[PDB]
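Q: How do we represent a protein-ligand complex in a form that can be generated token by token?
A: Start from the inputs.
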Amino acid sequence: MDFECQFVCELKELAPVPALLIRTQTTMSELGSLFEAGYHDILQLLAGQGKSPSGPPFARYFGMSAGTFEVEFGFPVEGGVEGSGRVVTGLTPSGKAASSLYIGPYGEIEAVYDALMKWVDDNGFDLSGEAYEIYLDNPAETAPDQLRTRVSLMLHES
Ligand SMILES: CCNc1cc2oc3c/c(=[NH+]\CC)c(C)cc-3c(-c3ccccc3C(=O)OCC)c2cc1C
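Then emit the structure tokens for the protein with rhodamine 6G bound:
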């Protein structure tokens, strides 16, 4: 039951758009707490300016899974939005990525990374080491067998 990139994996060119982000670090064990806290505080901050997110939330990773690791997470937003405290104005990812949609629990998401790494290797692409996840559904409110995540591995320079 290994994911297959045969038909669904693709290379995307990502258009960078504005976002509000929390740029910090965490451990596997604190990641859920962190996201629930941060994602809520951002929404709160958006509402503070009578603004709404313009897209589902996302996270960026690098050197993940090992001890304490880097994470950037947030929401894409309309222009004119401003951050406050640790919530900052930045951008969504730009450039090329090897990308696939995944449906299922986040726990079994490793398989999609496996398949994406096989597919990158086969097609002779090179990775930056960065991963990009878009959480299309709120996991709290969404059945696991219906939970949509887009998984992207960022590609390296020319
Ligand atoms: C259009 C999609 N919109 C959303 C997508 C979301 O994705 C989430 C992914 C997560 N993990 C990804 C690895 C975690 C941990 C929390 C998430 C929350 C979240 C935010 C605040 C409070 C609780 C949760 C929440 O879902 O509780 C977590 C059990 C969330 C919320 C919304 C609105």
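The chain has one domain: 1-158. Helices lie at 31-47, 110-122.
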